[PDB]
Design a protein around this ligand. Structure first.
Ligand SMILES: [Cl-]
Ligand SMILES: [Cl-]
Ligand SMILES: [K+]
Ligand SMILES: [Mg+2]
Ligand SMILES: [Mg+2]
Ligand SMILES: [Mg+2]
Ligand SMILES: [Mg+2]
Ligand SMILES: [Mg+2]
Ligand SMILES: [Mg+2]
Ligand SMILES: [Mg+2]
Ligand SMILES: [Mg+2]
Ligand SMILES: [Mg+2]
Ligand SMILES: [Mg+2]
Ligand SMILES: [Mg+2]
Ligand SMILES: [Mg+2]
Ligand SMILES: [Mg+2]
Ligand SMILES: [Mg+2]
Ligand SMILES: [Mg+2]
Ligand SMILES: [Mg+2]
Ligand SMILES: [Mg+2]
Ligand SMILES: [Mg+2]
Ligand SMILES: [Mg+2]
Ligand SMILES: [Mg+2]
Ligand SMILES: [Mg+2]
Ligand SMILES: [Mg+2]
Ligand SMILES: [Mg+2]
Ligand SMILES: [Mg+2]
Ligand SMILES: [Mg+2]
Ligand SMILES: [Mg+2]
Ligand SMILES: [Mg+2]
Ligand SMILES: [Mg+2]
Ligand SMILES: [Mg+2]
Ligand SMILES: [Mg+2]
Ligand SMILES: [Mg+2]
Ligand SMILES: [Mg+2]
Ligand SMILES: [Mg+2]
Ligand code: NA
Ligand code: NA
Ligand code: NA
Ligand code: NA
Ligand code: NA
Ligand code: NA
Ligand code: NA
Ligand code: NA
Ligand code: NA
Ligand code: NA
Ligand code: NA
Ligand code: NA
Ligand code: NA
Ligand code: NA
Ligand code: NA
Ligand code: NA
Ligand code: NA
Ligand code: NA
Ligand code: NA
Ligand code: NA
Ligand code: NA
Lengths: 53, 132, 337
RNA sequence: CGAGUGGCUUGCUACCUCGAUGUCGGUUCCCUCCAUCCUGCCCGUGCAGAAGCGGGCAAGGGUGAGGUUGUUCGCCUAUUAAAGGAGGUCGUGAGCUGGGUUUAGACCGUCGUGAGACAGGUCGGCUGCUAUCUACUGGGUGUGUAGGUGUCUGACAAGAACGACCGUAUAGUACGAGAGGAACUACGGUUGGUGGCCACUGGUGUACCGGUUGUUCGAGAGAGCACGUGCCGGGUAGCCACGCCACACGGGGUAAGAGCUGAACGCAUCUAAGCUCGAAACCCACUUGGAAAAGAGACACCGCCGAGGUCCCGCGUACAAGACGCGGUCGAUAGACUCGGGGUGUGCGCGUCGAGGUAACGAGACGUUAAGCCCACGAGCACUAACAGACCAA
RNA sequence: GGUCUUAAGGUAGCGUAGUACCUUGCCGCAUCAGUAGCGGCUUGCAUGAAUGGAUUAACCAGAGCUUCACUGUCCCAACGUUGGGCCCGGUGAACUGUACAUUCCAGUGCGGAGUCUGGAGACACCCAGGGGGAAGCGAAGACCCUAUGGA
RNA sequence: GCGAAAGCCAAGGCCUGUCGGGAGCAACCAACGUUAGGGAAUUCGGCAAGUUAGUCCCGUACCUUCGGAAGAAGGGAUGCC
RNA sequence: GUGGAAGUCUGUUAGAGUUGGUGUCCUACAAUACCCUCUCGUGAUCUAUGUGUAGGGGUGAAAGGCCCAUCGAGUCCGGCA
């Protein structure tokens, strides 16, 4: 799997999947990303993110 | 009961106010008890995903309010671990009113449902829109 | 009415004092069933990582599917049975009779013992065989030791010695088997005793935490509500009733917590290998890199990184052995981050 | 109606204390009793089954959460296998709390001429002490057994290390007109308790990095203060639980009870002699402690002019002092350095762009730049420091 | 009862009261469940008019109750910061002390014993701890009664 | 900055609210920070702690002695250049 | 619109007080202290200095409060052994 946020390859047996209100799904590879997301930021504007890269 | 096929961290307590994920006319729920549960001196009875709890209607239609019904925990905010090591958490804590036979009192279930809930409550499941 | 509640902590692991030997001493051995063999082995804890496996459990509705398991890595290099000790039955229990030693000793076994320079192997062997003839021969065990030098991550070189029972078919058949093992050079490996999929009881001296308060040492509550602001926060209500007029040992009190011996039952051996496949990127924290004979034990293992742990074929397993579990993945991701 | 047991209730008595044995309730923490609420085994039944009712053995374990009331008690709710009771100075204030009782202030009602009273109500109203002895929890030093190292034994000691429930198959089966509706056994899980561990999730993280407000160092750069981080954002290790792993069966002897053989008493009889079975209870099993077990242990080797040990030096898998464990050039124990592995999030400067403005000036954007800064971890590496050396010892 | 004591015999109000013994009164509201609270009822053990009655905007570190929000008050505890605590140098008290004292389980005794009696256990010294006991220390008991006491 | 407010800083004064040294510095205690999910279930009682917060615009109930209630409530904005 | 009233409001301005924490202390720093919190803060306000009232007497917005750590009758000495 790939983290739906930064895009790095999520290490098997690792990561959290957040189920949205509407039913949508987002697999985060780390707390750091989940938390960048909760701030309302978009991975594309973070230079450390594989997404941005 | 049947194995949920997952490990749960009860995210709820007696006195907890959750969402009623169905169209029964019941908006909010108040956890009163947890089926089959016996705690320990000073421990607040805890309830989580896939637990059949007893409830009381906090908000909704006048005729539904104050009623002591049974239900099933469909979603929680606290994370739950699946067989592959992943964690799963939802946007809120919600349950669905159920009857003696465990059949949804309602017609439709609003929002997503944890797959695990299927393996215990079919009719509830077979009533679901989205099963995560 | 005062609700009931079970006492805090168990009275089955006491006194709760520091351990005498940092090296574990089993006080029970497996039953003499199958062929002759050493009933134990040791190694040094390294760390933890998970592994993906194929549901092996036949009664599982998931048998056959993926499943992430937590595994503790243990460097289990070879050991050396340097001697065979014999015990004789007596009106006062079992007592050591004599011993059969060798001549080939590990370069650094003298950092612990005063290695034999003159020993009569045959007289010993005779004495034993005459005991057996008389039928006063009690069980038989091998004085063994580890080779810390074989493990770079472990600073010690001074070997850890420990006696381990040899169970086998007939006494005569396993007596011989023992002697054969010793005579060689005593050198044996985890493979010669265990096989992946089997269950083993892992002994070891837990992690020490010096003196700790009852709250942590015994799991008693902290002072609650307003009581917690009055000058007492982590002290128990009382040391007892007016009468009897004495403090009963069963009451939770402060003390030495940790560094106690613990024999953790039914641990599943997920895999016995060799190399650096289990090692993690960056190196196991506060340990190092693994790359030699190792073992993957399911779950956790008492003791802190670098501590010697001891294996033994489970003496009271609950399940049947489901040999060599298929390992589809072992995580090497850094234990940092 | 008659005979009793208990010492939880209440009363009687006035033996003990008035140079003070701190009150009620609660709380916290520990041990116990059985007259047993649940759980195990049984007997009877107005026992078809299921659900009960009554009774017997049994105290191993459990017996929980809430609403009113200071309440004990009790009422009420929803869960529950069940939500049993009692003793321990109505256990527990050199432990807590202080709502009530029971000081001084005050009100109301009743009584009183009045001061003032109440076995009435009400609002307010203080919780001292550095532990000598003993006790226990943990930690050391000596001596005895009578030179050292290593490995054990096991007299005895502790345990609940496990308790219980739900679900599936058995089975819509036995039973039953039907309604309804079991079991043995085999499985999966949960709950409480227990011991341990941190790969994973989660918390901390005043290590660390960034953003930013006020002010000061003239600006810039780089910094100090704002309580022991200004605030906000992120967070490694470690420690942790809300995270993870592990916690039998089976033998042996019994209670109640079910029976065998069997006599006194030709018969009969589970008992008088003998015997087969039979409880979550008892013993063993398993974990943990245990040569100070005075019958003060056993074995192997080393050594008695030398084995081993203390101090010394570098450090922790250890640690309040002490102890413990490891390394010491025949070396990777600590640091430097360089990699690796990680945390932040793109440095200074300079270049271009920039709403505008005559200009001066210009918040900020992009590039250089996964940059800059940083790390309680690992590896490589004798470069630095483990040097020198003292001592005890049959 | 359809007067008598002793003059009159409770009017407006208010009322289960900060006054109501019965009492958790009855009904309602509210809650899963409300000896609380609020409303109605009210025969008020033992309300009521300057012994002031009813009522009432504003005000209040005044007494009771409910909701939203909030949160380590709780479930259930964790980690961290600073000052102690612990070791070292210096300084250096006090409380308390009939004597003896390593106690424990029972018993006995003026009926609440480290010291008596029977047993059990117990090698000596020291460090830290939290305070079970010494009916621990502190105060010639404030309660109660007694004195041909005091104010 | 509304300010004789907070915070920072001069001048001036001081290191004399006068014992020090050492241990990642344990248990326990005093002051305190942060705690996931839940959210008063704690308790005599929400005690303690927390939440809210400055300024401007919009808007504001019952009741009232017309003074008040009222900053009711509720909603929006807030920098730098 | 002006005007700027008030035993008016907010307010750790100064200053006055003392609600809660039943916190810290309780052989104290202190024979009434410390801290946080809180009340008042243009008035029946607070305060310095001077001055008046004396013991069954003062003073008392009244608590039997206060009259030099002494108050249901101050303190000293005497009556008094
Ligand atoms: Cl419940
Ligand atoms: Cl408490
Ligand atoms: K008395
Ligand atoms: Mg990760
Ligand atoms: Mg409780
Ligand atoms: Mg207190
Ligand atoms: Mg990690
Ligand atoms: Mg006492
Ligand atoms: Mg009985
Ligand atoms: Mg018992
Ligand atoms: Mg309660
Ligand atoms: Mg009592
Ligand atoms: Mg009790
Ligand atoms: Mg006291
Ligand atoms: Mg006490
Ligand atoms: Mg005290
Ligand atoms: Mg009181
Ligand atoms: Mg009260
Ligand atoms: Mg009162
Ligand atoms: Mg002697
Ligand atoms: Mg600072
Ligand atoms: Mg009423
Ligand atoms: Mg009232
Ligand atoms: Mg009149
Ligand atoms: Mg004696
Ligand atoms: Mg007296
Ligand atoms: Mg009196
Ligand atoms: Mg008189
Ligand atoms: Mg929280
Ligand atoms: Mg409550
Ligand atoms: Mg408060
Ligand atoms: Mg004013
Ligand atoms: Mg003011
Ligand atoms: Mg004057
Ligand atoms: Mg008076
Ligand atoms: Mg004087
Ligand atoms: Na205190
Ligand atoms: Na305190
Ligand atoms: Na007491
Ligand atoms: Na009796
Ligand atoms: Na009595
Ligand atoms: Na006395
Ligand atoms: Na009490
Ligand atoms: Na029992
Ligand atoms: Na109650
Ligand atoms: Na008490
Ligand atoms: Na007290
Ligand atoms: Na048995
Ligand atoms: Na000995
Ligand atoms: Na009257
Ligand atoms: Na006032
Ligand atoms: Na806290
Ligand atoms: Na004591
Ligand atoms: Na005007
Ligand atoms: Na104050
Ligand atoms: Na006088
Ligand atoms: Na005199």
């Amino acid at each position: 799997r790939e983290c739906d946020y930064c895009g790095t390859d999520i290490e098997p047996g690792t990561g959290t999947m957040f189920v949205h209100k509407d039913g949508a799904t987002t697999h985060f590879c780390s707390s750091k990303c989940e938390n960048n997301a909760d701030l309302g930021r978009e991975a594309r504007n973070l230079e450390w993110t594989d997404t941005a890269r | 009961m049947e194995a949920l096929g997952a490990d749960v961290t009860q995210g709820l307590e007696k006195g907890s106010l959750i969402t009623c994920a169905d169209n029964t006319g019941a908006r909010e729920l108040k956890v009163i008890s947890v089926h089959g549960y016996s705690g320990t001196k000073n421990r607040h009875p805890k309830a989580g995903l896939g637990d059949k709890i007893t409830v009381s209607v906090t908000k909704g239609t006048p005729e539904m309010r104050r009623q002591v019904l049974e239900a099933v925990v469909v979603r929680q905010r606290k994370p739950i671990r699946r067989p592959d090591g992943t964690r799963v958490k939802f946007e809120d804590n919600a349950a669905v009113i159920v009857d003696e036979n465990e059949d949804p009192r309602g017609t439709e279930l609003k929002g997503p449902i944890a797959r695990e809930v299927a393996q215990r409550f079919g009719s509830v499941a077979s009533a679901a829109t989205m099963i995560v | 009415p005062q609700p009931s509640r079970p006492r805090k902590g168990s009275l089955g692991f006491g006194p709760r004092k520091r351990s005498t030997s940092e090296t574990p001493r089993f006080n029970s051995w497996p039953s003499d069933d199958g062929q002759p063999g050493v009933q134990g082995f040791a190694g040094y804890k390294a760390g933890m990582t998970h592994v993906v496996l194929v549901n092996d459990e036949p009664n599982s509705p998931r048998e056959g599917m993926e499943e992430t398991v937590p595994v503790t890595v243990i460097e289990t290099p070879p050991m050396r049975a340097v001697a065979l000790r014999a015990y004789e039955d007596t009106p006062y229990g079992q007592r050591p009779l004599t011993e059969v030693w060798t001549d080939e000793f590990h370069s650094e076994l003298d950092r612990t013992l005063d290695v034999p320079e003159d020993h009569d192997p045959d007289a010993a062997e005779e004495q034993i065989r005459d005991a057996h003839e008389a039928g006063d021969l009690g069980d038989l065990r091998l004085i063994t030791h580890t080779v810390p030098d074989a493990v770079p991550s472990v600073p010690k070189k001074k070997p850890d010695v420990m006696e381990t029972r040899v169970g086998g078919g007939s006494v005569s058949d396993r007596l011989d088997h023992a002697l054969d093992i010793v005579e060689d050079g005593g050198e044996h490996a985890m493979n010669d005793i265990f096989r992946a999929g089997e269950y083993a009881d892992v002994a070891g001296v837990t992690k020490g935490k010096g003196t700790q308060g009852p709250v942590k040492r015994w799991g008693v509550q902290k002072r609650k509500g307003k009581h917690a602001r009055q000058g007492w926060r982590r002290r128990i209500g009382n040391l007892g009733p007016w009468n009897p007029s004495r403090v009963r040992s069963t009451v939770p009190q402060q003390g030495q917590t940790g560094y106690h011996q613990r024999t953790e039952l039914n641990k599943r051996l997920i895999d016995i290998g060799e190399g650096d496949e289990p090692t993690v990127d960056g190196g196991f924290v506060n340990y190092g890199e693994v790359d030699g004979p190792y073992t993957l034990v399911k779950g956790s293992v008492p003791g802190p990184d670098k501590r010697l742990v001891r294996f033994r074929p489970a003496v009271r397993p609950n399940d049947q052995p489901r040999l060599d579990p298929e390992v589809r993945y072992v995580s090497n991701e850094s234990n940092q981050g």
